[PDB]
Amino acid sequence: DHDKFLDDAEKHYLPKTYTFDNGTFIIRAGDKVSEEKIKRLYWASREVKSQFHRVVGNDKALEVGNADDVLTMKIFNSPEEYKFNTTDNGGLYIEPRGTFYTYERTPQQSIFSLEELFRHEYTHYLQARYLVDGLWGQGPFYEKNRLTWFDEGTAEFFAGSTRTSGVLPRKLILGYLAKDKVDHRYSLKKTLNSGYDDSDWMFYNYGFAVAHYLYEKDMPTFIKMNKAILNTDVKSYDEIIKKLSDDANKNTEYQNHIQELVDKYQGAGIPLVSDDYLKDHGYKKASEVYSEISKAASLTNTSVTAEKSQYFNTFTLRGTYTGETSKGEFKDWDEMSKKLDGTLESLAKNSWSGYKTLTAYFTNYRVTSDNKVQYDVVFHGVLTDN
Ligand SMILES: CC(=O)Nc1ccccc1OCc1cn(CCNC(=O)[C@@H](CC(C)C)C(=O)NO)nn1
Ligand SMILES: [Ca+2]
Ligand SMILES: [Zn+2]
């Protein structure tokens, strides 16, 4: 009956299953999706994850028992096979199933690569698990277009995550901005009120530009905005949006930022994972890895957990970082990001090629009773010591 037909369809279209992170990251794929590509997507998720948690400051799921305790990713062979299964929007995330859908494609079928679209949808999984309480489409953050620019603009933004250089702008998004008429560039206020009902969806790109403008030029506002969402503080979020929307000088800065982004189009890259993740790194004793990381990052109270994946094992090293006297959450955030990236580049300078697989982030800003900056710090990497 109808049971055999749904399962037969999934077998025909998605015969392959690839399992990572002790069963919590599952790629269901067509038989023409290469295993090299599967591996790239796994390490891409960790790059996006690391930058997301740095910005949000939380890595604990907001709810207990939700479907996205297991992330499933269904990657069809081609645009045609994706369409039949539902039309072509590139990809889609469904939070109550913890699942997103997209497809492999050639350069002749899309300007966007599979890894770019994957990075976008993975950001929606991160938003929905770690930042936006309740379910997508429900509650006050899903009235009045409150989060429409944010959900889609920060998903385009974090799709540009790198390993050791933070979040970088993406060439194809800048190309959309650059190709637009100057006269038609959205105001800050227009972008913050855009919705899925608009005449076109250029808000994805102007929404990206708001996120990137705040990231580079006003991280205090980005941090406060993320904290209001995290805390389901509608009043604080609305105060921030109104202050951004009503300040002409803020729009001037955002317009200037759009133009600087356009000027970067020619020389911009496409952040995708390095081939260095795919190398055969070889054995390195686990204790040496953990000790070298803890020393380079100046981490105390360190714990580690090991996970099994289809093609390798990984480790997640958690520690506390207590630095110097705090210069405020916002100045601290900037310093912490620079120190952490500098550590990642040092550990990869020379040594085990496995150090080129490391991603790192920090969360849960606080200060001690002596007013020292304090962060929970997290490293993730390949583990070749069974
Ligand atoms: C059901 C549910 O939980 N959704 C959900 C949850 C959390 C965050 C966002 C979510 O969906 C947002 C969305 C976006 N579209 C429009 C259709 N798709 C697209 O246009 C793509 C384009 C992108 C690949 C460039 C998209 O933007 N892909 O994402 N419809 N819901
Ligand atoms: Ca949610
Ligand atoms: Zn999206």
Residue numbers in the entry: 398 to 483, 490 to 789
Manuscript excerpt for this entry:
We rationalized the screening results based on the crystal structure of 27 in complex with the ColG-PD, solved at a 1.80 Å resolution. The bound inhibitor occupied the active site from the S3 pocket to the S2′ binding site. This explains the observed preference for the ortho-configuration of the acetamide group. The central triazole ring hydrogen bonded with Glu555 and formed a π–hydrogen interaction with Tyr599 in the S2 binding pocket. The hydroxamate group coordinated, as expected, the catalytic zinc ion. The isobutyl group in the α-position formed hydrophobic interactions with Tyr607 and His523 in the S2′ pocket. The hydrophobic benzyl group of 33 can be expected to fit similarly into the S2′ pocket. An initial screening led to the identification of hydroxamate 27; the SAR study was performed using COLQ1-CU, which is articulated around a 1,4-disubstituted 1,2,3-triazole ring. The results revealed that both compounds inhibited clostridial and bacillary collagenases in the low micro- to submicromolar range.
Bacterial collagenases process triple helical collagen under physiological conditions into small peptides and amino acids by targeting multiple sites. In the latter, two histidine residues in a HEXXH motif and a downstream glutamate coordinate the catalytic zinc ion.
